[model samples]
Target chain A: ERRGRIYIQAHIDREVLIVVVRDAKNLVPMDPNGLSDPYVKLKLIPDPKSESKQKTKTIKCSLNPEWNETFRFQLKESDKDRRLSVEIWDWDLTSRNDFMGSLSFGISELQKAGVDGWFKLLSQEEGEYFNV
Target chain B: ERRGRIYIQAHIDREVLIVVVRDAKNLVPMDPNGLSDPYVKLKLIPDPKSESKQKTKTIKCSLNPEWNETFRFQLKESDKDRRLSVEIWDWDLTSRNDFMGSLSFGISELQKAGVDGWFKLLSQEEGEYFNV
Candidate 1:
């Protein structure tokens, strides 16, 4: 069956970031449209201790139909001790800024959790199951 | 202070996939190596009831010093119903594939969970606190 997969690799101190995308379409899968698109913005939210509220910084090209793209964003020296965050959202018709389901991660922590080969199974032990 | 975050969006039915990498380095931030890097091999594991045991498909490209690039992979038709999963890994050397921290979501579920917009907080109120 066709399936879609994403792999994200982060640097230790949280400076460099790498992401990979893979899809099994010919098999048994979903179309790219249902996956969300570019208009959906990706942003960096600063820590409260910093002088800025959650602001948007350029991470370069996003939402391309391609599988993977590498984006670089510069970090502040002060950020070493602080936390860095990235957010994902879907737009709502009611509000230009409204969102649906979302996911997040800590830069430094994920580095520590580092991922390698073998697919990490998403638990189906609970929740609603559906055929794509 | 610095912050950590992750953003993920799915395709329609969730077939084609794309990902981006970004980090803040110079200002107030963490080191590139500290974010989490390679040694983490990217794989496409097959779904169950499909006669395969989470087989790893190559999406190509992962864990580097630079910020962005692009990667692509093909999908299978049988996969439309079975969920595709990608897992991260950390080598313990002891067991060869030991993992500490992990996160996940369903392909179709996440596709429906499409995300875009302002930063959604990860609710740090729970969980043990630690400085990275």
Candidate 2:
């Protein structure tokens, strides 16, 4: 399959939502060297030009990459019930970043069952695929 | 003409070069409201991936935008004589960020004469256009 698994955690601190990209495992090798420089991009669905799309730094040449990075998003009342999408990509030196896999969950999902765990990656062709 | 002007300042600080996007003026308006939502992207050219490309925050609906943002890059011996590029873009809510203008200077040039001033924008057609 084209999908692997990604580890993440989401928690609310004060009025901000902090998203932690802990690590990823079993990523597909995108380079001829059988390695991947993996990173993550986060987006807010139904966003009103939130203008805060962010990305994690790349983990060079490791199938199991550990980022342990935190991205903080200031929450809005409208942010509730909206969706947060995470997309994994392989960084290419001279070309576009290649998509690895992605997954999404509702902000309401954070009210509960937002527990930290590994989320199975989706091919991004499975459903609701849109552009930047 | 289709070009405007961008203001920038670059200097080295204790083995790290800090590039400042002070502001821009007389930018060609990309939006229909006779204004542009402008930002800046700083990139290193003709070298190994420094992997530290950075962007300034968007200035909304103002032909004259002042960011006063600073992006710092650690220098390497190999980084000498390479080029640093500054690209001005109009951030679109959807779709790609539109290119307003771009310019480049050799890292060697930063040894001096990198004073703060407004630079004429290039349409990206005059010389050395490449894909992302």
Candidate 3:
């Protein structure tokens, strides 16, 4: 059963990527705590199919009261791809290292795809209704 | 006659700093070409009267077209003064180096200020209407 899980889709069309973490259950919900926690961490691990190609870079953002309820990841030029993997961890009463969830999706390239593309790509594995 | 000029007032209320020189003009309108040129340079020189010993830090913005047509200085944590000194330079038709202009004003510190605050602080010196 999936609970307290987060996933990533391979599609990112805007210059800014926003990932929001809204619950205030971690040691320090924002940075400055810099302690590695499942609270939130993402890296664009180079896909083996494109290992030789440069991996996209992640633009780190500082925590804000607004993001406390919602977190965002601003993507730069490097973070373009058809498929990318991401791991998301949220506080779970059942697990010790926080409840962890992992998923991979490709970056949607067509601007015409819009948020519809985003929802489709993210929900591809689940076939569930999603909204952005 | 108007000449290549730049100036500033002691006011900024943004989270980013962006400045640009789009001449193909300067030796280079971007950094990496960091040579001190009136062609383009900015510093948040603290006001002598503002000897509070707590001066604002300048948020240096990188060059972008995006910004070349519209240069911006994203003000961050410390830049909250009502008055500031800014000197701007652009290649002049008859100068060996570049033409320069300087001005000072207080940080508006008002959300109502908007780009209006920016243009006022900038154009306040010349009384010339400007745009963002």
Candidate 4:
């Protein structure tokens, strides 16, 4: 089984990371109308038992949507191995929202990518899912 | 100007506090339909730099709704002087959510009241507000 993994470089300074949710392409529509209203939800794994989970606004009626949103999270030196999980959801007016897909990567990957870009959304099975 | 106040007993044991969001009475309906979808948001003051903020689920389409929901937050010895802020909101599907009212008290007050009851909801100015 794939378990939780940590990725941090010991020498890097602890600073806030700017995560930009750019857009999604070729998404599988979860709506009954074959057109889904999707939104991205971002979370820092192994969160301190205090803060609220962060997310972005829903873009109505589109499978391929451009969010162009920016979120700032304080990254500590201790969070080197922590994972960032991004989940996509289809908003529903009359019922529970449907999950489209998700992607999870390590802080090291972000550091490697310089913590910016258009990341492809993948299912939990296809991504590195972490418990903390 | 009203400033932030801390409420904690120096000698008390640090344990989790259970916040029960009971029913709201005679709330002004923010919806044009004369009914509001209400939800209670709870926050612990003087938060650490790393934790997520906490809140409750939305109860739909009632001016006065019964939540009776329980939320648990870890109380530390350091949080003795912290305040608990509860805000009521009218959930809006198409626009920004409207604020109904709020109530804030110290952990000391909870220790005094034993931290459980049908506490009255008040506005921000009417309640004790804390920064951090």
Q: lDDT order of candidates, best first?
A: 2, 4, 3, 1
User: Which pairs of residues have clashing backbones in candidate 2?
Assistant: none
Better of 2 and 4 by lDDT: 2
Ranking by TM-score: 2, 4, 1, 3
TM-score of chain A of each: 0.39, 0.84, 0.35, 0.74
What candidate 3 gets wrong by more than 4 Å, as runs, is A7-13, A23-38, A47-78, A82-84, A90-99, A109-132, B1-132
Measured by C-alpha RMSD in angstroms, how accurate is candidate 3? 20.1
Fnat for each model: 0.00, 0.00, 0.00, 0.00
Candidate 2, B1-132: lDDT as tens digits: 235677777877766778888988787655545467888888777645747578899989887889999888888887785677788888878656666767776676676645467676653432123211
Q: Alpha-carbon error at B70 in model 3, in Å?
A: 75
A86, model 2: CA deviation in Å? Answer: 1.0
- What Cα-based lDDT does every candidate model obtain? 0.28, 0.71, 0.30, 0.59
Best by TM-score: 2
- Per-residue C-alpha lDDT of model 3 across residues B1-132, encoded as one tens digit per residue: 112222222223355433332321112121112222333334443534533222122223212111132344545446564333343433333333322233343333332343222321121222211222
Model 4 residue B68 distance off true place after TM-score fit, in angstroms: 1.9
Worst 10 residues of 3 chain A by lDDT: A120-129
Q: Top lDDT: which candidate number?
A: 2
**DockQ values per model:** 0.02, 0.01, 0.01, 0.01
